[PDB]
């Protein structure tokens, strides 16, 4: 019940970010040495916020900051409510926020705030909705920040307004995208921090050729033939059928081209798996299209290899959040072709690091262009990797936290 986790250093990234940047990070940290920078979320297992904190906490300590991470606890009933809250904030309008739910949420947050004086720290950062209410059960005497890791583009009003009540009390609210900053909030207290990728995680670490080929062979992917790929959850707004059309049109001129539709989805995401099934029906018996998901063993390291083996990566989303899959591709020096939506529009510098397109026809022309001019593809991929290196990796992410804290 509100226990601290105790079980990665900046030096680990030296060769990746260069000394000039390592020193720059250490400098900004000077003003914060010894100070307590506490993080609070709802779990230390799985990916998401936990996966981030497992690397960020040790990383902040490696530079002199007394970073700590606490996890609140509660019965399944409390987590069923937070689960409903998540979906509701995601956009489900059928859900209703009752007085019982609000009571359980508040009640639980209150209990957890007893096994520690969170207010006794230099800086407090609460991650996501689950523990947002803690700020209500403490005598505030230092900066309190709230980090939103979810897509808050069009939340169920009644659920957001309830959360807004707690969020509004913090000194700063951090979102992934400008479009997530609800209008009720004070823009002078709103901050935009895009999610980041960790070059050393299983999804991004540079794999060796022998291991990539072993993975490709297991899933019948031929590296000696052209490969175009799109990584994303399976749903009707990710441009998946468009990608199939793009692939088919490209295949008319490049007969050996292969399409990889990659995605990892939760055991309890039926709608996701249903669209996966519809995708397979649509494709039919053209086995040059590879549908690769965790249903058949595809995990982080496999996704890693698939992106590395790709000649061109696509992200034709109609609806999208920041789009870390684009970030992942750019880090692997891959030219990306996507639609100007969500974070795709901000990450891709058209004609420079990749191409932003309106539709399938445009995408076909650009896939052929890249496939026909590998030197350009190489050029664009290199720039795309640098953009990520200087903007979207975990060390830059931590650097922005330093900038934030120092401005308080």
Q: What dihedral do alpha carbons 150, 156, 159, 165 form, nearest 10°?
A: 80
Structural contact between residues 371 and 254, judged by C-beta atoms closer than 8 angstroms = yes
Domain ranges of the chain: 1-196+394-408, 197-393
Tokens, residue 122: 């230099």
User: Taking Cα atoms as reference points, which of 249, 250, 176, 181 lies closest to residue 400?
Assistant: 176
- C-alpha distances in Å from residue 38, one per residue of 71, 114, 131, 253: 11, 16, 13, 56
- C-alpha distances in Å from residue 337, one per residue of 240, 243, 279, 318, 347: 13, 11, 21, 13, 11
Q: For the structural domain made of 1-196+394-408, what CATH number should be given?
A: 3.40.50.2000
197-393 maps to CATH 3.40.50.1440: no
Task: Find the angle CA(118)-CA(134)-CA(158) to the nearest 5 degrees.
Answer: 160
Structural contact between residues 258 and 216, judged by C-beta atoms closer than 8 angstroms = no
CA-CA distance, 19 to 10, in Å (whole number)? 11
Tokens, residue 382: 């290199």
CA-CA distance, 343 to 194, in Å (whole number)? 9
Is 197-393 the same fold as 1-196+394-408? yes
What number of CA atoms fall less than 13 Å from residue 138's CA on the CB side?
Answer: 26
Q: Please, what sign has the CA dihedral across residues 90, 95, 99, 100?
A: negative
Structural contact between residues 240 and 262, judged by C-beta atoms closer than 8 angstroms = no
Structural contact between residues 112 and 73, judged by C-beta atoms closer than 8 angstroms = yes
Residue in this structure with the two tokens 């707004």, named with its chain if needed: 237
User: Taking Cα atoms as reference points, which of 348, 327, 328, 346 lies closest to residue 337?
Assistant: 348
Greatest alpha-carbon span in the chain: 68
Structural contact between residues 225 and 254, judged by C-beta atoms closer than 8 angstroms = no
Tokens, residue 281: 């029906």
Tell me the residue length of the chain.
408
- C-alpha distances in Å from residue 274, one per residue of 262, 277, 316: 15, 5, 20
Residues 6+ apart with CB under 8 A from 105: 78, 81, 82, 85, 133
129 class by beta-carbon count within 10 Å (0-12 exposed, 13-18 middle, 19+ buried): buried
- C-alpha distances in Å from residue 138, one per residue of 81, 109, 110, 205: 23, 11, 10, 41
Ramachandran region of residue 220, left (φ > 0), alpha (ψ -120 to 50) or beta? left
Structural contact between residues 321 and 89, judged by C-beta atoms closer than 8 angstroms = no
Residue in this structure with the two tokens 């995708």, named with its chain if needed: 279
Q: In what order do the strands lie in the sheet with 144-147?
A: 3-5, 66-71, 36-41, 123-127, 144-147, 172-175, 190-192
CA-CA distance, 95 to 230, in Å (whole number)? 32
Give the other-Cβ count within 10 Å of 356's Cβ: 20
3-state secondary structure of 86: helix
Segment (H or E) for 89 = helix 76-90
Please tell me the experimental approach by which this structure was elucidated.
Answer: X-ray
CA-CA distance, 247 to 44, in Å (whole number)? 40
DSSP string, 195-233: --B-TTSTTTSPPPHHHHHHHHHHTT--TTS-EEEEE--
Resolution (A): 2.2
């Amino acid at each position: 019940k509100m226990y601290e986790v105790k079980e990665r250093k900046l030096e680990d990234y030296k060769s990746i970010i260069g000394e000039e940047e390592v020193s720059k990070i250490q400098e900004k940290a000077e003003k914060l040495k010894g100070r307590s920078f506490v993080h609070v979320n709802s779990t230390s297992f799985g990916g998401g916020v936990a996966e981030i904190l497992h690397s960020l906490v040790p990383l902040l300590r490696s530079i002199g900051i007394e970073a700590r991470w606490f996890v609140i606890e509660g019965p399944t009933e409390f987590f069923n409510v937070t689960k409903t809250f998540h979906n509701a904030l995601q956009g489900n309008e059928s859900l209703k926020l009752t007085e019982e739910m609000k009571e359980l949420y508040l009640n639980v947050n209150r209990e957890n705030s007893k096994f520690i004086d969170l207010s006794s720290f230099d800086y407090v950062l609460v991650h996501d909705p689950q523990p947002a209410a803690l700020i209500e059960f403490y005598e505030k005497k230092s900066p309190w920040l709230w980090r939103c890791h979810i897509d808050l583009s069009s939340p169920n009003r009644e659920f957001w307004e309830f959360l807004r009540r707690f969020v509004e009390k913090y000194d700063r609210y951090i979102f992934h995208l400008p479009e997530y900053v609800q209008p009720e909030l004070d823009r002078n207290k709103a901050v935009i921090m895009p999610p980041s990728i960790d070059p050393l995680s299983e999804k991004n670490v540079e794999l060796k050729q022998t291991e990539i080929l072993r993975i490709l062979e297991r899933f019948d992917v031929d590296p000696e033939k052209p490969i175009i790929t799109q990584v994303s959850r399976f749903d009707p707004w990710k441009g998946i059928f468009d990608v199939i059309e793009i692939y088919r049109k490209v295949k008319e001129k490049i007969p050996g081209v292969q399409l990889l539709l990659v995605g990892v989805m939760a055991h309890d995401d039926p709608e996701g798996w249903i669209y996966f099934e519809k995708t397979l029906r649509k494709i039919g018996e053209d086995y040059d299209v590879k549908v690769l998901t965790n249903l058949i063993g595809v995990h982080a390291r496999e996704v890693n290899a698939f992106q590395r083996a790709s000649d061109v990566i696509l992200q034709m989303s109609i609806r999208e959040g920041f789009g870390l899959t684009v970030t992942e591709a750019m880090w692997k020096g891959k030219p990306v072709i996507g639609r100007a939506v969500g974070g795709i529009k901000f990450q891709i510098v058209d004609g420079e690091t990749g191409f932003l397109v309106r539709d399938a026809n445009e995408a076909v022309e650009v896939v052929l262009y890249l496939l026909k001019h590998p030197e350009v593809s190489k050029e664009m991929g290199a720039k795309a990797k640098e953009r990520v290196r200087k903007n979207f990796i975990i060390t830059k992410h931590m650097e922005r936290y330093l900038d934030i804290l120092n401005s308080l």
